[PDB]
Amino acid sequence: ETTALVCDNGSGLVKAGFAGDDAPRAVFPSIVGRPRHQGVMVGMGQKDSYVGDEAQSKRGILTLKYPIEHGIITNWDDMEKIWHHTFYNELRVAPEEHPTLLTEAPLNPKANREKMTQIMFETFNVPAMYVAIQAVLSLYASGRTTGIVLDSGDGVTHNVPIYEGYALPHAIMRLDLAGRDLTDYLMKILTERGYSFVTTAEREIVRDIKEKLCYVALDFENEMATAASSSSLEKSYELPDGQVITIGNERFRCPETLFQPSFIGMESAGIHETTYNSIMKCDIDIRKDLYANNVMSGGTTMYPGIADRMQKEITALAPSTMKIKIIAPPERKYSVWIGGSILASLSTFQQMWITKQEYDEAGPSIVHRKC
């Protein structure tokens, strides 16, 4: 073998596989679990820590942690455990054979790339690697040279505007709010019905409520009126122990935090204003071309009704004659991956990867010259 690896490490789930695949081979939570409790059955062969679907299976005995928070790697020992598990347990390949494409968010600390680069060359010994900005990959998963991408993952939401292959880096806008902050708001508003979720193992239950039940209100003050005056919007979820939750306005007060970050206590404007102020910060005669081309990606763009509310809201800010389109592909949870497999199969980018030779010549500051 010689095919490239790709690793879309992003905040919530790891995604990994080979360039030229359709879809990731590994898709698992970016968690490390460590035992919370007194080990008592001798001879069990209990491990010191559990990663991904092992930790997501054994939740009740583990304190779960994610090393990535807001797209920034906060714990390198846990992140090296996630990368070792990715190569060795999920893909079952030696990293020393394969050039590796990593992904990350715009406006991240420069330390995060340097330490990724150092671990890929000094701990996993890859022959060559690269870092690519996630919303660029999501643009080029779409088969487009021009567009603005909203890329709400688990921990960060960014808009990147790209015109005929050129990013406009002054019109990049980043918001440190996404699906993990929505799970933490849903924990807050679920306590109003009387349900209590407090452990990290319960945060993963509330995340699963949110992915199955929540949806985006095409007019929040009208769904608020319909939920305050009927049982027509309420749905139920069966917990692991068979208790039955029921929720109504909690289904759309959570997703509405994307449009009103003041619910979570932030001053910054919603994803619709953040998008529009990225389009209006661009040059006057490339705006018409970005309004026609709002790609969306990452899982926090997956709610029923979110493309419709986003299309309603940018149409409310834009000139009356503009043809707004929002490109929400069915697979948009994997567009950063699909982009990474394509923009690593290309013959023209095989000269763009950082080689271990160039790392030995310059140390970990090599990524800022290259990427």
């Binding site: 059955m41 001879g43 069990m44 062969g45 079952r92 030696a94 020393e96």
Partner: protein
């Protein structure tokens, strides 16, 4: 003997300790090829016979050869099976300790022929040859009966013995062969209920189904197709062209008759073999308490007729574990895993017991009719042992792991005895033990067998530990507990370079025969032998005469849990070792020179594997010790005294001082030789070959003096 060393360029060295580059395996295999081309199939490593199969009726076993090797010391003659035969007989007549001969090799390497021909030397030359010939025929006519029940087809050969066969001949104080004994050790009883791909079960089942009267099978499960039975078909290999099962059955059925089984005892024995088939076809299902129950009645309809037990009792025994406490007896039900293990433990136990009973029935037919009890003068046994060789396949498993641990333990014993046998002579002759370094078998037996950290004690725990348990969880515990060991490796412990050769779900042992890689899949299923007291208590109640003798009432007293197959194998192996430490073993090691079964073809790519599996290079390392050669000063001086003027024709005094002047004329440097209490030692064979090459030129002068004396005498005879 040195007379052959002049021909060492075509005829090779006779004993490999004389091969000069003794650490070169390529020279060892070259000296084997050199001899085998010359039809010299026998060579020593000190006392150990190395033999290579001629695939020809060489005339060397005839009566004129036996009396050539009778009463002659084994290094004063060329190597032969009869030089081992005579030496083993003389040690019995003279030390009056018991003697053994390990016949060793690959399957097909000629082990049968060595055993048949040793039992010819002890028949055709001993002082009661009529009883000796009868004991030979009773020892050898047992072969179809033991071969049907204890050989199976493997990936490597069609007819491989899966047990350590033993055969004594019993001798009185007069050296008359009085009778015999048979025993059988370390049978691969896992093969009754699980076979690897391309391998059959023991030969009797396919013999029974392929060859048999319709009225003989009609009393049993009568469907002729061997695929009908779960215990015959796991290996997918049932039909094969090389094994005429119909003819093999007609020979074996007559061998049972001629061995003195009465017809009803064969009908009992066929009914045990068919009961083992039907035990495989029992299907359990779980009722709503997750407890196992027999679903299919047609197996039990015959198992009551054939095992001779009550059907309601066999249903209960296959599905409940009986415990006895405070005098109450408690039937705890089995789950589907435990009920499958109970059915397969009963098949392994019914079969390994009818086989142990065939060996008792035969052994009791070899024993003496005389009382053999005090004040009877003495009795001594001379035995042949024939246990399976080291075993490396494409996919090694729990059977190979046991076979290779057995061979590791027998190699350990053998190299300890060889090292002891050299060191006792270095101490006796007063030579310093110049310390050889050799592969230390202790470390790899401690890895397998050590009480609470060996692989077997970890595997015994994985069958006993609570919760869901897997072959991969076993491996993950080996990887944690064995971890830093030098002879152990896995895909996790392997460096990135070696990790290409080794899969996940495998571990690797470095054995004396090199590395062997074991797939863990099936280790837990094969190590479980859950024969509960409830199953033995059922079987001891049988109407079938064999099963009644096989499951005695006294065994039911034992309050221990059922021991695992690796633990039973460890215990039985250490009992085979103490039998061989107490007894005096000779060794014969057999090489198969090609896999085509062909005359004259010597295939070094195959022979390198056997020479490695037989450990011949490690034995040569230890036997060679510090010195290639040693000989008594009397024997060394009477040979070479013609080289040094002072010693010729007769030396002036004590032979040690005659050698001490002779080796000074030959100019041996102080490190090339040593002068022990009654032997000269020579360090390198260089010195010896040069001395026999000095004697070979000296023969010209010796013959000249004889001819001059004759030509002088000739005139005084012919005239006046």
């Amino acid at each position: 003997m040195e007379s052959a060393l002049t021909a060492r360029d075509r005829v090779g060295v006779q004993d490999f300790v004389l091969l000069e580059n003794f650490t070169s395996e390529a020279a060892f295999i070259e000296n084997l090829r050199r001899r085998f081309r010359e039809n010299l199939i026998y060579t020593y490593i000190g006392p150990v016979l190395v033999s290579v199969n001629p695939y020809r009726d060489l005339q060397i076993y005839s009566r004129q050869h036996m009396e050539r090797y009778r009463g002659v010391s084994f290094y004063e003659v060329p190597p032969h099976l009869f030089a081992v035969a005579d030496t083993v007989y003389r040690a019995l007549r003279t030390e009056r300790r018991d003697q053994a001969v390990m016949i060793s090799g690959e399957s097909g390497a000629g082990k049968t022929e060595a055993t048949k021909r040793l039992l010819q030397f002890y028949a055709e030359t001993c002082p009661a040859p009529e009883r000796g010939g009868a004991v030979r025929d009773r020892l050898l006519q047992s072969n179809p009966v033991l071969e049907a029940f204890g050989n199976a087809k493997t990936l490597r050969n069609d007819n491989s013995s899966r047990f350590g066969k033993y055969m004594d001949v019993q001798f009185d104080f007069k050296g008359a062969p009085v009778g015999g004994h048979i025993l059988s050790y370390l049978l691969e009883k896992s093969r009754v209920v699980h076979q690897n791909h391309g391998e059959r079960n023991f030969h009797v089942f396919y013999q029974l189904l392929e060859g048999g009267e319709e009225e003989t099978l009609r009393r049993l499960g009568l469907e002729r197709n061997p695929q009908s039975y779960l215990y015959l078909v796991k290996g997918q290999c049932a039909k094969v062209s090389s094994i005429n099962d119909k003819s093999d059955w007609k020979v074996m059925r007559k061998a049972l008759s001629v061995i003195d089984f009465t017809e009803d005892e064969v009908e009992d024995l066929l009914s045990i073999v068919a009961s083992v088939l039907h035990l495989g076809n029992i299907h359990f299902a779980a009722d709503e308490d997750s407890n196992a129950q027999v679903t299919t009645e047609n197996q039990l309809k015959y198992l009551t007729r054939l095992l001779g037990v009550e059907g309601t009792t066999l249903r209960e025994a296959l599905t409940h574990r009986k415990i006895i406490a405070k005098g109450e007896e408690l039937l705890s039900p089995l789950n589907l895993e435990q009920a499958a293990y109970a059915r397969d433990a009963l098949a392994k136990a019914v079969y390994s017991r009818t086989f142990t009973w065939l060996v008792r029935k035969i052994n009791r037919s070899l024993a003496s009719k005389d009382a053999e009890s005090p004040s009877w003068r003495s009795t001594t046994v001379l035995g042949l042992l024939d246990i399976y060789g080291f075993e490396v396949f494409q996919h090694n498993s729990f059977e190979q792991f046991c076979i290779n641990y057995c061979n590791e333990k027998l190699q350990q014993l053998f190299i300890e005895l060889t090292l002891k046998s050299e060191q006792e002579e270095y101490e006796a002759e007063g030579i310093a033990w110049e310390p050889v370094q050799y592969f230390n078998n202790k470390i790899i037996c401690d890895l397998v067998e050590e009480k609470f950290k060996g692989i077997i004690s970890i595997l015994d725990e994985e069958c006993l530990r609570p919760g869901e348990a897997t072959d991969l969880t076993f491996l993950e515990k080996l990887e944690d507990t064995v971890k830093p060991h030098p002879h152990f490796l896995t895909h996790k412990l392997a460096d990135q370079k070696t990790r290409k050769s080794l899969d996940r779900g495998e571990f690797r042992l470095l054995h004396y025969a090199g590395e062997v890689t074991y797939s863990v899949t099936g280790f837990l299923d094969k190590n479980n032998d859950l024969l509960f007291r409830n199953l033995k208590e059922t079987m001891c109640s049988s109407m079938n005469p064999i099963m009644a003798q096989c499951f005695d009432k006294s065994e039911l007293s034992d309050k221990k849990r059922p021991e695992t197959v690796a633990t039973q194998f460890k215990m039985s192996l250490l009992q085979l070792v103490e039998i061989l430490r107490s007894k005096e073993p000779a060794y014969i090691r057999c090489i198969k020179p090609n896999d085509a079964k062909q005359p004259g073809r010597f295939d070094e790519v195959l022979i390198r594997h056997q020479v490695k599996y037989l450990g011949l290079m490690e034995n040569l390392r230890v036997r060679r010790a510090g010195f290639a050669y040693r000989r008594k000063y009397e024997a060394f001086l009477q040979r070479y005294k013609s080289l040094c003027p002072e010693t010729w024709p007769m030396w002036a005094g004590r032979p040690q001082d005659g050698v001490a002047v002779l080796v000074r004329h030959l100019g041996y440097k102080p490190e090339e030789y040593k002068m022990g209490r009654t032997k000269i030692f020579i360090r390198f064979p260089k010195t010896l070959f040069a001395t026999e090459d000095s004697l070979e030129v000296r023969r010209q002068s010796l013959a000249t003096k004889i001819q001059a004396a004759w030509r002088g005498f000739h005139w005084r005879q012919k005239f006046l």
